[PDB]
């Protein structure tokens, strides 16, 4: 059964698919080893904050637990990198309280996509720069993230990074328990700092999760060849057998 | 009317390796898409239900000028049933001119164009 | 300011060796702003990619398998 | 074949019969079949194909007196392992020596692929556990080092999981100790060449698989004989 | 100078399926492409215009040694064009050794003698 020239169309389609796939894997592998570059470049600033935030012996539990911050990408083909975080979020919101309460900030369309239809939205972030996340326009989110305090005690949701592509989703928390007495300046510069680091590790995941999801596809696509190469040969055979049988059977007729 | 009907259908068959991006930023091309996804509904017909030319070139008119867009893609089929009865009653003059001459404006422009404003403006949700 | 007897650390959200005038670091906070938005290419390649990925899948790289 | 059979039955030897591209044979087979006016079979192959192949092979074996081992270069038809031509041949195969240009580019000769080149003789029933064990193992340690090629370009040679780095280390020496000294090679090399019994070849591997050599340089086990030769290859002198 | 020619061209064949996705152009995989896309230029020949081995091995030398690499593809073809004449006048001695011996053991002279050209060429 089936065609031949319809088996070629499939092979070549698959091939050009594997191509485009493996392209992006390498491309997203090129965006892992630039995540360090902006990961490193942030190593010092973090050190020289906890060193400052050494904490004198001389805002603890205020009232509630309210808003979240949910880190993602705008682009797809990342494996579950999105759905996962967008699960914990959706769980420990509805595992939380069930009024229209418990509010939200999202980074990357894909997040805002689900969050939108569900309700409880607060802010927006689109077009993060990819491997180089611009520390700048995340600074506008620290402001919204803090000044929002209209708020109490936020948690941040994203994926961590351990060794190339292997990763896991987390809730580290932040806005609680870890001139003179200038907290008006450390409170802010300690959130701007965390929401940022969160990204670098988020993105590091993104590219990774994509680097892989674009391997799984490549690898799989490559198997689609085997499954077709086989059905092509078979249809290559029955065809060359029918053609011949036709050419002889038309001679014996003479 | 049937002329641009090809173009509208063309793009849709051809823009449709695009529609994913959706709005992300696709600009003026979800526009050419809109009526595209509408037109298919128009080209949809039910078994054993022949439609005369006269009124036929009227619905194949309405969408090809925007008169069908203010209405959702999933309400088009109903719109045919609808706008056609109300053509059979409301207005009647352009329902066989298209027959007599069998050609051309079917009402100069303004008539059809505004007569299409007639039933649209009187339809449902 | 981290003032240590042997070292001085200046934490800065934004710092650029700049002139007397400050209304430069803004200048750098400027010429860098939209010139980071101009990074639509980031977005647009992936479009062209999500594109190709759905054009090699268009031929329904499998017709009822086969 | 005939010339060969002589030395098998008359002088009761074990003779080698090389046939370079046995496909030419079957191809000539369908090629002749036409001329005699034979109605073609699957893919224009002489209907009498199996038969013509069966008669060529069965005449190749070990008699109560002698034996005839045949090495036939099977050049498969368009990369299709289902083609009646090869597919037929394979039923007559007890073994495969798969040569690959890769292992050659690295400086492993013979170029015999260690994971591809197979054999029917590899079985406890036949070679006992000793051989089968080490041998099936030496393959495992390869299909480990082969897959880690991807992760090595990822997490590098560091902390890639130490139960693996041992593999990567041992494996390299192993695929290196598969290269041997060919007498025929002495022409242009000068090293006289090797002949290692399976016995010898079992130990050299079992020992390496025990890691008893992990402290020795790569370029040791690369082109030698008995494991003991690798060892002497450790005197860099002075 | 032919042994390496297959290499550079090899990888480029297995690689340059990716440019448009290479918007992120990465690694040193950019380097393989580098002279790669350049060799192709050198492999492009005119019609009705054969090339003698003498001044052929030299151009198949240039790019494979980097004496070409500093020149963009736009200018690769119209380079080898006068690098011939530059030789037919000033290396006419050099290409000789190439004839009468069919060898280049040359390696030293040409290495510097190639610069004699790029260091006078246009752009």
Short mmCIF file of C-alpha atoms in Angstrom, two decimals, chain C residues 3 11-12 15 21 27-33 35-36 43 49 51 53 55-58 60-61 65-66:
data_model
loop_
_atom_site.label_atom_id
_atom_site.label_comp_id
_atom_site.label_asym_id
_atom_site.label_seq_id
_atom_site.Cartn_x
_atom_site.Cartn_y
_atom_site.Cartn_z
CA UNK C 3 34.56 50.67 52.90
CA UNK C 11 27.96 48.91 44.23
CA UNK C 12 26.09 50.53 41.42
CA UNK C 15 27.90 52.95 36.42
CA UNK C 21 28.08 65.44 34.16
CA UNK C 27 22.83 59.26 27.88
CA UNK C 28 24.29 55.78 28.14
CA UNK C 29 21.05 54.60 29.77
CA UNK C 30 19.56 56.10 26.60
CA UNK C 31 21.64 54.98 23.63
CA UNK C 32 21.47 51.57 25.21
CA UNK C 33 17.70 51.51 25.84
CA UNK C 35 19.20 49.83 21.11
CA UNK C 36 18.18 46.91 23.29
CA UNK C 43 12.19 37.47 18.35
CA UNK C 49 12.40 29.20 12.75
CA UNK C 51 8.06 29.06 10.56
CA UNK C 53 9.40 24.02 11.65
CA UNK C 55 6.52 24.32 6.87
CA UNK C 56 8.31 20.98 6.96
CA UNK C 57 5.55 19.80 9.04
CA UNK C 58 3.08 21.23 6.56
CA UNK C 60 2.24 16.50 7.12
CA UNK C 61 5.58 14.83 7.22
CA UNK C 65 1.88 7.48 8.20
CA UNK C 66 3.18 5.26 5.33
#
